[PDB]
Amino acid sequence: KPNPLQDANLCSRVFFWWLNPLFKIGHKRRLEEDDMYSVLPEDRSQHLGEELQGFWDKEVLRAENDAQKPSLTRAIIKCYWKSYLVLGIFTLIEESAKVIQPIFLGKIINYFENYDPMDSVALNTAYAYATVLTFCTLILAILHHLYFYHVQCAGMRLRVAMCHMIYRKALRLSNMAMGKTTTGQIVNLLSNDVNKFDQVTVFLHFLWAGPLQAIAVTALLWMEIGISCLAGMAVLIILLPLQSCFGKLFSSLRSKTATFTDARIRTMNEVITGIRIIKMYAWEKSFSNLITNLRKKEISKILRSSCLRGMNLASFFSASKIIVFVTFTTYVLLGSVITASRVFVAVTLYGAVRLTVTLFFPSAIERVSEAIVSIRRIQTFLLLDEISQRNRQLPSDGKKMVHVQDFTAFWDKASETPTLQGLSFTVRPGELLAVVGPVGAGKSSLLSAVLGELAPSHGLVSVHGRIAYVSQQPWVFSGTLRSNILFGKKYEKERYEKVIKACALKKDLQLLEDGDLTVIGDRGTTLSGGQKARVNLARAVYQDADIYLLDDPLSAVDAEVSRHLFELCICQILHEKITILVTHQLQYLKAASQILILKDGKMVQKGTYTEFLKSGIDFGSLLKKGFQAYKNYFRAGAHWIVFIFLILLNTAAQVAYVLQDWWLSYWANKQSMLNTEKLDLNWYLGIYSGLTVATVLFGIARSLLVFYVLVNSSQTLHNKMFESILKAPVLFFDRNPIGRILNRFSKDIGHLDDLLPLTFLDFIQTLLQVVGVVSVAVAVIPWIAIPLVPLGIIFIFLRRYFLETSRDVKRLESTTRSPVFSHLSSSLQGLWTIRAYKAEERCQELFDAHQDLHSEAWFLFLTTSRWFAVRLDAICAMFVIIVAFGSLILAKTLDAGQVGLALSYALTLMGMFQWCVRQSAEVENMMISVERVIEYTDLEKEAPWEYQKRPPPAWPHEGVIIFDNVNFMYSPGGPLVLKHLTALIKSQEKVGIVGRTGAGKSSLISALFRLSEPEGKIWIDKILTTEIGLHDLRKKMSIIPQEPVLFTGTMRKNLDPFNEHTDEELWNALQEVQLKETIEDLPGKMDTELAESGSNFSVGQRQLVCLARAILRKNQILIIDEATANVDPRTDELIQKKIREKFAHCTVLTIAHRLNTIIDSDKIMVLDSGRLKEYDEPYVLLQNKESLFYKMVQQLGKAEAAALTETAKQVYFKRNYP
Ligand SMILES: CC[C@]1(O)C[C@@H]2CN(CCc3c([nH]c4ccccc34)[C@@](C(=O)OC)(c3cc4c(cc3OC)N(C=O)[C@H]3[C@@](O)(C(=O)OC)[C@H](OC(C)=O)[C@]5(CC)C=CCN6CC[C@]43[C@@H]65)C2)C1
Ligand SMILES: Nc1ncnc2c1ncn2[C@@H]1O[C@H](COP(=O)(O)OP(=O)(O)NP(=O)(O)O)[C@@H](O)[C@H]1O
Ligand SMILES: Nc1ncnc2c1ncn2[C@@H]1O[C@H](COP(=O)(O)OP(=O)(O)NP(=O)(O)O)[C@@H](O)[C@H]1O
Ligand SMILES: [Mg+2]
Ligand SMILES: [Mg+2]
């Protein structure tokens, strides 16, 4: 992938002419990673990393010699100052040109004031000054883009070198340092703490070019207009503390809103997760009240912050007008006169110095502070204690063996008991040494000590030869299964096939789409734990090391796979290699040549399996311990009359802004056309003050109205979205995951609430300023409207051409960034396995390649932006040149005031044009959140909660249920679940529910509750379920679900959200459920907040709370669904007994996976794939062996079957025959 930048000349590099093929390809089709240009040799990660590493080591050595702390900042400066001085020269030149050009503007105006049509020398001089002005504009418009690209390239180089150094350090962190730190911190100081270097270098050179430009501008202003410039300078200086105060208050007002936003998001997550339980209980009104209160509380603070930001923007808009008004008011009041060669030079100088003082200097200060903080963080990281490099090995005879003598060490030096107590043993090739012990013995500690991870406090360890080590937890890195097995070594087909066959990985390969080439992500999302363990063992065997160390290889695999592995990949293959193995299964101890028993870090016994059998101590014994989007977004805010008023306000503000400068020009012309007689100062100064006041007030009003309208639109959209969500049927929640649902409530609404209104206001402001500049230029010289049409057409086509490729470049850069973090995380998690072999330089090379693949896209991201900016600035410079030369060509018509006004506005169009284009692009990007919110606004809605026809309040009187021809489908067009169910449930009868694991037992409650609209007729106390609203039907039947859920709140809230009961009644219910004494010992009597689903409460406690809820509701129809699954027998018996005794006179339908709980039921439904087979007493079903009830009873066993039959017979005899 050759880089055309390596070929281009200086002329092509100035205009970025070498990116045209890339833009052509991007316009034609989509851009993939194969279309990117490889980085230049000087920008490769390894080169920069090694250069900065050498400089940093030299600085460290010097600092240690001098005996002070080292300075990463000093190292970086010593490395990059020579390359960062030339950019300083160029920014000096650029700032000098910026300061210079108003002088030539004033010279042109001065020529216009002393016009003489017959003179030609003055015309020639004016043309020369115009040429110099065009040269200055070209300098500011053309070369600045190459300068900016190099400025950003410096920061990119710094960041790449920093990342390389950080990874190189992290690859050799000691055990204690790794215990201090975490993987998250190391990933964070690459994802967030290294990106400050991209931004520090942009504004770094302004720390000396800001005050210098301010001083030069002040000197020029004093030379031009006199002492009156001090008032404008004072106002400009005062402008900074106002910004500081605004930013200080805005941060507090913003941080005061997260405490409501996070609570709202947490409640939303709870609602979305437990939507089925809420719908069954009909608590949507309570949750709606809670969410509404939280939203209002957050919206108040959002409104306050928006008002503050609008005031800040209005202050920026009116600052220049205020400065100029004050300056020229004191200038005129001191006794001078108004002239166009001075007014419109002071205006331009004030504008330039105001931009520089207000924005660039504070931005530079902030970026430098952040970069210093990040540098200090990385500097602290780079001095963590590192593992001492494996020193010169003791001279041996080349034999491969492992020996340990008198070893004693501890991970922590403050521990009372050492990790290992005087270990002393040796192992030779061909010996299968096994270590057997309980959890915590220290077998993995012994293996780590052999590897060298445990620093020997006392004793000696002699290990020679290559090492094969198997971690307790299998590890898979960012690659493929073939890559995992190869571990970077050269691929051999025969050896790979031999290892695959020996490891029985053929089934795992066949289970994958690509087989052995399938990509496995972080933590093996595409694989399983057994596959990871098999891959780890295969890699260890394939690497073909002299010494093999194993640690818990077969704990998490099946019996056949474990036996086949332990035999054919260890006993035969590794019979020529040194082997030390850690076991937990006793069946593999027979094949072990050596066995050691370890407990409490102390040696117990070592010998063969026969010797241990003769010892008499049992191992087992020892092992037991579009446009419509904009239209709807604007309509949701306010009426269209408000839109008309907003348009009028914007127009009035811009008109006053222009008219103040026009009035200055008119004053200058009227003073010039005079004669002593004097101008009436009262009139002119009064009109000036009125125009300034009107500009300020109109700007403030426009900003406030825009902000309020857009925030109201966001609030209305959120209300509509939540209202729609609360009524969507369960099918919608089944289709969409919880994360997707919560994303539109967390991120999209977050954008709409704070970012979009302010972005819109800024874009409108800048666009109106550009329109005003163009309108002034057209009004002064009408002929300028001719080339404006070609310029607009060219701009539109160029914008389309650029945007067809910029988005692809941005997505490529976004998708090429995560592999770096994934590789870092994988290498950090498998650091011991990486360091076991000598392959860490290969991991460094892989990381370098991953970093290069991202710098590949960053380069394009910078260059395409510069490519667009060059042409935009060319268009703007053409406009400026046209104005400046047409004014001189038509000198017989215009006058000084008009010429100066038009020329100054043409000069100020710069930067504003580019910012307007960028903000338009950003707004178009941001509208997708509004699109998604509006999409969720109009979801499908289920039946209304209430109907016109209301049943009597006493219904259900008895509780008789009729099922007639019930066909149930979860989704329309999906498979049928229930097939023509026909049954009658008499009042106050206990019915048990039986069938297979997919018989549809839990599908009956959905039909009864009408969660999904069923087909057929269901009659309850002679009312059909399809002619009454859902909230009037679900409220009269109680449900006890499989997994109880408790919502975060008070116990009174959890037991009675609608305050329909009394505290005494709730206490009586709690006493009935025997949880009252547990309730009344917390810090609060009944208002104790809980965690998610009551994480501090037991499962039995949650079931008991659900039973208490059912008791409190005290409805006639009770349904229980899979009550006891993994609860203790005591709580199971408690729940069964309480349910049996408390609801004697209430109809109960119970679905139980076990027949023990539902043996005493009066009747039993038999379900076969949604077909109702048998409905009668359980004794009758057990009488006939052909019944499915008898078959399932016999499936359980014999003794339990006999007990169940006896219990059913006893129940039948007691009930039917009293
Ligand atoms: C304090 C007074 C004043 O604001 C300073 C100062 C001047 N302003 C007047 C308008 C203005 C600004 N530049 C201009 C350049 C030419 C002509 C006019 C202007 C700007 C500003 O503030 O315009 C409101 C500004 C704004 C944003 C900006 C960068 C920027 O100047 C460099 N961004 C770059 O990406 C955006 C931002 O979102 C971002 O960086 O996002 C990752 C940014 O947020 C952060 C955290 O930086 C911000 C502004 C804080 C926040 C919300 C909305 N977005 C829209 C554009 C952007 C802005 C700077 C007045
Ligand atoms: N890397 C480590 N850092 C800190 N403590 C450790 C480390 N490795 C082991 N230990 C401690 O050393 C003691 C014994 O470890 P060890 O028994 O090898 O762990 P184990 O493998 O989970 N149990 P076992 O399988 O019987 O060896 C325990 O107190 C561990 O917490
Ligand atoms: N939301 C759903 N959408 C579509 N089919 C479903 C859904 N939930 C369950 N099913 C299937 O519909 C059939 C009805 O079985 P089901 O409702 O689970 O009763 P059950 O299995 O006997 N009781 P349980 O095992 O506790 O769920 C089964 O084949 C389920 O897999
Ligand atoms: Mg261990
Ligand atoms: Mg079910």
JSON list of N, CA and C in Angstrom, two decimals, residues 446-473:
[
{"chain": "A", "resi": 446, "resn": "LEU", "atom": "N", "xyz": [3.70, -22.99, 43.85]},
{"chain": "A", "resi": 446, "resn": "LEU", "atom": "CA", "xyz": [4.91, -23.72, 43.50]},
{"chain": "A", "resi": 446, "resn": "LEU", "atom": "C", "xyz": [5.22, -23.58, 42.01]},
{"chain": "A", "resi": 447, "resn": "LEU", "atom": "N", "xyz": [4.20, -23.68, 41.16]},
{"chain": "A", "resi": 447, "resn": "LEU", "atom": "CA", "xyz": [4.43, -23.52, 39.72]},
{"chain": "A", "resi": 447, "resn": "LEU", "atom": "C", "xyz": [4.94, -22.12, 39.39]},
{"chain": "A", "resi": 448, "resn": "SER", "atom": "N", "xyz": [4.35, -21.09, 40.01]},
{"chain": "A", "resi": 448, "resn": "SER", "atom": "CA", "xyz": [4.80, -19.72, 39.79]},
{"chain": "A", "resi": 448, "resn": "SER", "atom": "C", "xyz": [6.23, -19.53, 40.28]},
{"chain": "A", "resi": 449, "resn": "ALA", "atom": "N", "xyz": [6.58, -20.15, 41.41]},
{"chain": "A", "resi": 449, "resn": "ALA", "atom": "CA", "xyz": [7.95, -20.08, 41.91]},
{"chain": "A", "resi": 449, "resn": "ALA", "atom": "C", "xyz": [8.92, -20.74, 40.93]},
{"chain": "A", "resi": 450, "resn": "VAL", "atom": "N", "xyz": [8.52, -21.86, 40.34]},
{"chain": "A", "resi": 450, "resn": "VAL", "atom": "CA", "xyz": [9.35, -22.51, 39.33]},
{"chain": "A", "resi": 450, "resn": "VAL", "atom": "C", "xyz": [9.53, -21.59, 38.13]},
{"chain": "A", "resi": 451, "resn": "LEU", "atom": "N", "xyz": [8.45, -20.94, 37.69]},
{"chain": "A", "resi": 451, "resn": "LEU", "atom": "CA", "xyz": [8.55, -19.99, 36.59]},
{"chain": "A", "resi": 451, "resn": "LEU", "atom": "C", "xyz": [9.44, -18.80, 36.92]},
{"chain": "A", "resi": 452, "resn": "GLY", "atom": "N", "xyz": [9.57, -18.46, 38.20]},
{"chain": "A", "resi": 452, "resn": "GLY", "atom": "CA", "xyz": [10.28, -17.26, 38.61]},
{"chain": "A", "resi": 452, "resn": "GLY", "atom": "C", "xyz": [9.40, -16.09, 38.98]},
{"chain": "A", "resi": 453, "resn": "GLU", "atom": "N", "xyz": [8.07, -16.25, 38.90]},
{"chain": "A", "resi": 453, "resn": "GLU", "atom": "CA", "xyz": [7.16, -15.19, 39.32]},
{"chain": "A", "resi": 453, "resn": "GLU", "atom": "C", "xyz": [7.26, -14.91, 40.81]},
{"chain": "A", "resi": 454, "resn": "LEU", "atom": "N", "xyz": [7.67, -15.90, 41.61]},
{"chain": "A", "resi": 454, "resn": "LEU", "atom": "CA", "xyz": [7.85, -15.73, 43.04]},
{"chain": "A", "resi": 454, "resn": "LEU", "atom": "C", "xyz": [9.33, -15.48, 43.31]},
{"chain": "A", "resi": 455, "resn": "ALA", "atom": "N", "xyz": [9.66, -14.27, 43.74]},
{"chain": "A", "resi": 455, "resn": "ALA", "atom": "CA", "xyz": [11.05, -13.93, 44.02]},
{"chain": "A", "resi": 455, "resn": "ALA", "atom": "C", "xyz": [11.54, -14.73, 45.22]},
{"chain": "A", "resi": 456, "resn": "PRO", "atom": "N", "xyz": [12.65, -15.46, 45.09]},
{"chain": "A", "resi": 456, "resn": "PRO", "atom": "CA", "xyz": [13.11, -16.30, 46.21]},
{"chain": "A", "resi": 456, "resn": "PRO", "atom": "C", "xyz": [13.68, -15.49, 47.36]},
{"chain": "A", "resi": 457, "resn": "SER", "atom": "N", "xyz": [12.93, -15.39, 48.45]},
{"chain": "A", "resi": 457, "resn": "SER", "atom": "CA", "xyz": [13.45, -14.74, 49.65]},
{"chain": "A", "resi": 457, "resn": "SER", "atom": "C", "xyz": [14.62, -15.53, 50.24]},
{"chain": "A", "resi": 458, "resn": "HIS", "atom": "N", "xyz": [14.51, -16.85, 50.26]},
{"chain": "A", "resi": 458, "resn": "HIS", "atom": "CA", "xyz": [15.58, -17.71, 50.73]},
{"chain": "A", "resi": 458, "resn": "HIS", "atom": "C", "xyz": [15.58, -18.99, 49.91]},
{"chain": "A", "resi": 459, "resn": "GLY", "atom": "N", "xyz": [16.76, -19.58, 49.76]},
{"chain": "A", "resi": 459, "resn": "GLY", "atom": "CA", "xyz": [16.91, -20.80, 49.00]},
{"chain": "A", "resi": 459, "resn": "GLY", "atom": "C", "xyz": [17.48, -20.56, 47.61]},
{"chain": "A", "resi": 460, "resn": "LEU", "atom": "N", "xyz": [17.21, -21.51, 46.73]},
{"chain": "A", "resi": 460, "resn": "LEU", "atom": "CA", "xyz": [17.70, -21.44, 45.36]},
{"chain": "A", "resi": 460, "resn": "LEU", "atom": "C", "xyz": [16.78, -22.22, 44.43]},
{"chain": "A", "resi": 461, "resn": "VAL", "atom": "N", "xyz": [16.67, -21.73, 43.20]},
{"chain": "A", "resi": 461, "resn": "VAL", "atom": "CA", "xyz": [15.90, -22.38, 42.15]},
{"chain": "A", "resi": 461, "resn": "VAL", "atom": "C", "xyz": [16.76, -22.44, 40.90]},
{"chain": "A", "resi": 462, "resn": "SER", "atom": "N", "xyz": [16.98, -23.65, 40.39]},
{"chain": "A", "resi": 462, "resn": "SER", "atom": "CA", "xyz": [17.76, -23.87, 39.17]},
{"chain": "A", "resi": 462, "resn": "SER", "atom": "C", "xyz": [16.84, -24.49, 38.13]},
{"chain": "A", "resi": 463, "resn": "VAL", "atom": "N", "xyz": [16.47, -23.70, 37.12]},
{"chain": "A", "resi": 463, "resn": "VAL", "atom": "CA", "xyz": [15.60, -24.13, 36.04]},
{"chain": "A", "resi": 463, "resn": "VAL", "atom": "C", "xyz": [16.29, -23.80, 34.73]},
{"chain": "A", "resi": 464, "resn": "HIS", "atom": "N", "xyz": [16.50, -24.82, 33.89]},
{"chain": "A", "resi": 464, "resn": "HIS", "atom": "CA", "xyz": [17.15, -24.65, 32.60]},
{"chain": "A", "resi": 464, "resn": "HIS", "atom": "C", "xyz": [16.35, -25.37, 31.52]},
{"chain": "A", "resi": 465, "resn": "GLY", "atom": "N", "xyz": [16.22, -24.74, 30.37]},
{"chain": "A", "resi": 465, "resn": "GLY", "atom": "CA", "xyz": [15.47, -25.28, 29.26]},
{"chain": "A", "resi": 465, "resn": "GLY", "atom": "C", "xyz": [14.17, -24.52, 29.03]},
{"chain": "A", "resi": 466, "resn": "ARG", "atom": "N", "xyz": [13.58, -24.78, 27.86]},
{"chain": "A", "resi": 466, "resn": "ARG", "atom": "CA", "xyz": [12.33, -24.12, 27.50]},
{"chain": "A", "resi": 466, "resn": "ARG", "atom": "C", "xyz": [11.19, -24.63, 28.38]},
{"chain": "A", "resi": 467, "resn": "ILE", "atom": "N", "xyz": [10.22, -23.75, 28.64]},
{"chain": "A", "resi": 467, "resn": "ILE", "atom": "CA", "xyz": [9.15, -24.01, 29.60]},
{"chain": "A", "resi": 467, "resn": "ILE", "atom": "C", "xyz": [7.81, -24.00, 28.88]},
{"chain": "A", "resi": 468, "resn": "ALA", "atom": "N", "xyz": [6.99, -25.00, 29.17]},
{"chain": "A", "resi": 468, "resn": "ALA", "atom": "CA", "xyz": [5.59, -25.03, 28.75]},
{"chain": "A", "resi": 468, "resn": "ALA", "atom": "C", "xyz": [4.73, -24.95, 30.00]},
{"chain": "A", "resi": 469, "resn": "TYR", "atom": "N", "xyz": [3.90, -23.91, 30.09]},
{"chain": "A", "resi": 469, "resn": "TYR", "atom": "CA", "xyz": [3.10, -23.65, 31.27]},
{"chain": "A", "resi": 469, "resn": "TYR", "atom": "C", "xyz": [1.63, -23.54, 30.89]},
{"chain": "A", "resi": 470, "resn": "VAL", "atom": "N", "xyz": [0.78, -24.16, 31.70]},
{"chain": "A", "resi": 470, "resn": "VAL", "atom": "CA", "xyz": [-0.67, -24.13, 31.51]},
{"chain": "A", "resi": 470, "resn": "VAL", "atom": "C", "xyz": [-1.28, -23.39, 32.69]},
{"chain": "A", "resi": 471, "resn": "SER", "atom": "N", "xyz": [-1.99, -22.30, 32.40]},
{"chain": "A", "resi": 471, "resn": "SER", "atom": "CA", "xyz": [-2.64, -21.53, 33.45]},
{"chain": "A", "resi": 471, "resn": "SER", "atom": "C", "xyz": [-3.88, -22.25, 33.96]},
{"chain": "A", "resi": 472, "resn": "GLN", "atom": "N", "xyz": [-4.26, -21.91, 35.19]},
{"chain": "A", "resi": 472, "resn": "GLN", "atom": "CA", "xyz": [-5.50, -22.46, 35.75]},
{"chain": "A", "resi": 472, "resn": "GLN", "atom": "C", "xyz": [-6.71, -22.01, 34.95]},
{"chain": "A", "resi": 473, "resn": "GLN", "atom": "N", "xyz": [-6.75, -20.73, 34.57]},
{"chain": "A", "resi": 473, "resn": "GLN", "atom": "CA", "xyz": [-7.82, -20.21, 33.74]},
{"chain": "A", "resi": 473, "resn": "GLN", "atom": "C", "xyz": [-7.35, -20.14, 32.29]}
]
